[PDB]
Amino acid sequence: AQYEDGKQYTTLEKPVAGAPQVLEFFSFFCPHCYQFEEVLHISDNVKKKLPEGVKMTKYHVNFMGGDLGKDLTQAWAVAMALGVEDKVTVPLFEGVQKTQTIRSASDIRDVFINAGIKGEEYDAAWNSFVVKSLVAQQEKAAADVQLRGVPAMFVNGKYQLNPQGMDTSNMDVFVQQYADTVKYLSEK
Ligand SMILES: Cc1cc(Oc2ccc(CC(=O)N3CCOCC3)cc2)ccc1C#N
């Protein structure tokens, strides 16, 4: 077969029922995740190869960065609750990994203020039980797959992308192989 278990993807031994159709995990501390966002735009290119309106879900993880890692999972919940993911993803990645200006929850909040989220609006969300629920959802989804590494993408709770088994001499070719694999898996 052109697509083979163990090559472009692996099959979960314990599939996860009722999972999101396309589920990505990342950390703002994760170096390949930085590439996946700013250099490769993996999520956008996957979406462009899937049918219109299909659910893509993207969740932050706790297991990198200690205290701040957990603050970032909560901030991602705020971003999802307010719908401002596209406004804060790049400045959070660059503040953690490029300028290293994010050292505290207050620095995370500054990114949202600078992106135009009002202070009262950010603080109300940060402390909301709706956001507590979104944090729990992010934790539960990672726990469902005993997630120990990012970037990770899961398709229908059954298949895990294997980018290590793709060619990376050409960055566009890699993105295309990755997106085409998600499409193939989604059609299984
Ligand atoms: C073109 C390109 C390809 C890449 O392939 C990748 C190689 C490995 C991973 C997995 C990984 O790192 N994990 C998962 C579990 O273990 C802990 C961390 C992801 C992508 C990476 C970067 C770039 C660029 N630019």
UniProtKB/Swiss-Prot annotation:
Pfam family, one: DSBA
UniProt-listed GO biological process terms: cellular response to antibiotic
CDD domains in UniProt: DsbA_DsbA (cd03019)
GO cellular component: outer membrane-bounded periplasmic space
Effect of disrupting the coding gene: Induction of the PhoP/PhoQ two-component regulatory system, suppressed by 50 uM CuSO(4).
SUPFAM superfamilies named among the record's database cross-references: Thioredoxin-like
GO molecular function, one term: protein disulfide isomerase activity
Location in or out of the cell: Periplasm
Protein name as catalogued: Thiol:disulfide interchange protein DsbA
Disulfide cross-links: C30-C33
Family in the record: Belongs to the thioredoxin family. DsbA subfamily.
Functional note: Required for disulfide bond formation in some periplasmic proteins such as PhoA or OmpA. Acts by transferring its disulfide bond to other proteins and is reduced in the process. DsbA is reoxidized by DsbB. Required for pilus biogenesis. PhoP-regulated transcription is redox-sensitive, being activated when the periplasm becomes more reducing (deletion of dsbA/dsbB, treatment with dithiothreitol). MgrB acts between DsbA/DsbB and PhoP/PhoQ in this pathway.
Primary gene name: dsbA
Keyword field: Disulfide bond, Periplasm, Redox-active center, Signal
Thioredoxin domain span: 1-131
